[PDB]
Design an enzyme around this catalytic site. Structure first.
Site, PDB file in Angstrom:
ATOM      1  N   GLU A   1      -6.015   7.119  -1.259  1.00 14.40           N
ATOM      2  CA  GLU A   1      -6.000   5.925  -0.424  1.00 14.40           C
ATOM      3  C   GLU A   1      -6.736   4.790  -1.113  1.00 14.40           C
ATOM      4  O   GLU A   1      -6.557   3.632  -0.740  1.00 14.40           O
ATOM      5  CB  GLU A   1      -6.623   6.190   0.944  1.00 14.40           C
ATOM      6  CG  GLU A   1      -5.650   6.748   1.988  1.00 14.40           C
ATOM      7  CD  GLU A   1      -4.717   5.693   2.587  1.00 14.40           C
ATOM      8  OE1 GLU A   1      -4.102   5.972   3.639  1.00 14.40           O
ATOM      9  OE2 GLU A   1      -4.605   4.593   2.013  1.00 14.40           O
TER      10      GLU A   1
ATOM     11  N   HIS B   1       1.773   4.284  -2.720  1.00 16.60           N
ATOM     12  CA  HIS B   1       1.643   5.689  -2.394  1.00 16.60           C
ATOM     13  C   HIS B   1       2.869   6.456  -2.868  1.00 16.60           C
ATOM     14  O   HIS B   1       2.749   7.560  -3.390  1.00 16.60           O
ATOM     15  CB  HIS B   1       1.440   5.872  -0.892  1.00 16.60           C
ATOM     16  CG  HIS B   1       1.098   7.275  -0.501  1.00 16.60           C
ATOM     17  ND1 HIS B   1       1.112   7.707   0.808  1.00 16.60           N
ATOM     18  CD2 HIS B   1       0.752   8.349  -1.250  1.00 16.60           C
ATOM     19  CE1 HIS B   1       0.779   8.986   0.848  1.00 16.60           C
ATOM     20  NE2 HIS B   1       0.558   9.400  -0.388  1.00 16.60           N
TER      21      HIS B   1
ATOM     22  N   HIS C   1       0.799  -1.214   0.000  1.00 19.53           N
ATOM     23  CA  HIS C   1       0.000   0.000   0.000  1.00 19.53           C
ATOM     24  C   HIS C   1       0.841   1.277   0.000  1.00 19.53           C
ATOM     25  O   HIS C   1       0.515   2.235  -0.695  1.00 19.53           O
ATOM     26  CB  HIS C   1      -0.902  -0.007   1.230  1.00 19.53           C
ATOM     27  CG  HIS C   1      -1.805   1.177   1.320  1.00 19.53           C
ATOM     28  ND1 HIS C   1      -3.131   1.126   0.952  1.00 19.53           N
ATOM     29  CD2 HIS C   1      -1.575   2.444   1.736  1.00 19.53           C
ATOM     30  CE1 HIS C   1      -3.681   2.310   1.140  1.00 19.53           C
ATOM     31  NE2 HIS C   1      -2.756   3.129   1.608  1.00 19.53           N
ATOM     32  N   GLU C   2       1.913   1.291   0.783  1.00 19.30           N
ATOM     33  CA  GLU C   2       2.742   2.486   0.927  1.00 19.30           C
ATOM     34  C   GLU C   2       3.782   2.632  -0.172  1.00 19.30           C
ATOM     35  O   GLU C   2       4.212   3.743  -0.472  1.00 19.30           O
ATOM     36  CB  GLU C   2       3.436   2.487   2.286  1.00 19.30           C
ATOM     37  CG  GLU C   2       2.484   2.565   3.458  1.00 19.30           C
ATOM     38  CD  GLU C   2       1.641   3.826   3.441  1.00 19.30           C
ATOM     39  OE1 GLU C   2       1.775   4.622   2.481  1.00 19.30           O
ATOM     40  OE2 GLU C   2       0.842   4.017   4.390  1.00 19.30           O
TER      41      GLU C   2
HETATM   42 CL   LIG Z   1      -2.506   4.831   5.166  1.00 17.75          CL
HETATM   43 ZN   LIG Z   2       0.169   6.545   2.685  1.00 20.65          ZN
HETATM   44 ZN   LIG Z   3      -2.732   4.935   2.614  1.00 23.43          ZN
END
Ligand SMILES: [Cl-]
Ligand SMILES: [Zn+2]
Ligand SMILES: [Zn+2]
Length: 247
Positions: free
Chosen positions: A106, A79, A75-76
């Site tokens: 997100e 990002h 997830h990061e």
């Molecule tokens: Cl997050």
């Molecule tokens: Zn993040």
């Molecule tokens: Zn996030």
């Protein structure tokens, strides 16, 4: 394709790139791919993780379970690539604003998380060997090393012929309940969580007999209607991963 569909398409292309050049998607290899970033594990209260692009460092709640840890990582990383792409980043800034964009990003982190952990290839490799079944799902989930719910949406998104996936658990054959659910391209029938699993239904038998199955049966629509379709129940650690190929 509209912005949210164009963005997601992009984010997949991104996860796809970053990931492509990895010796696998295992947690360790995902790390190595980080073009010089401090990846720190530590307790973060009730917060799975964070990404600090000023100090170039991803933080991942060490308290949490390996499942979400691995995901919060995927997830990061996602990002980080979004902030990397000035177009996807820019186009986004001129279509959403405030929390509205915040929610969108997100969301694109999750789209990308999945792209990273569950290569299109792998899904298809499994969708080919095992077809669209409750086992194609059991294999992708155990093989990409992510949850049945995480792999429930990824697998249904590559499935062409109308099918309905669902990951199951007990109430307490024995009586189980629908927890997650996913519709193939064609399908418009919806199998929501909370929906219970009759004791006579193959899937129950499956998880009870701790033994795989597969036979013509029906989609036990919470409502009340029993719609026929070929079920393939794959039981395991008390979850019955199941497919409902609507004809
Ligand atoms: Cl997050
Ligand atoms: Zn993040
Ligand atoms: Zn996030």
């Amino acid at each position: 394709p509209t912005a949210l569909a164009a963005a997601k398409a992009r984010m997949r292309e991104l996860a796809a790139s970053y990931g492509a050049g990895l010796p696998g998607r295992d947690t360790h290899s995902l790390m190595h791919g980080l073009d010089g970033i401090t990846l720190t594990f530590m307790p973060m209260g009730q917060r799975d993780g964070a990404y600090d692009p000023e100090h170039h460092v991803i933080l991942i709640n060490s308290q949490v379970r390996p499942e979400r840890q691995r995901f919060t990582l995927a997830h990061e990383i996602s990002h980080a690539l979004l902030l990397g792409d000035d177009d996807l980043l820019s186009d986004l800034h001129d279509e959403y604003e405030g929390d509205r964009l915040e929610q969108v990003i997100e969301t694109l982190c999750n789209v990308g998380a999945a792209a990273l952990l569950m290569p299109a290839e792998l899904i298809d490799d499994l969708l080919t060997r095992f077809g669209p079944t409750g086992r194609a799902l059991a294999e992708l989930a155990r093989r990409a090393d992510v949850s049945a719910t995480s792999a429930l949406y990824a697998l249904a998104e590559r499935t062409a012929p109308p099918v309905i996936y669902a990951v199951c658990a007990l109430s307490r054959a024995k009586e189980l309940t629908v927890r997650a659910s996913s519709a193939s391209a064609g399908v418009k029938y919806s199998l929501s969580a909370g929906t219970p699993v009759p004791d006579d239904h193959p899937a129950a038998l499956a998880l009870d007999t701790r033994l795989p199955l597969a036979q013509d049966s029906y989609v036990p629509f919470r409502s009340g209607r029993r719609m026929p379709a070929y079920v393939d129940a794959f039981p395991e650690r008390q979850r019955v991963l199941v497919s409902f190929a609507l004809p």
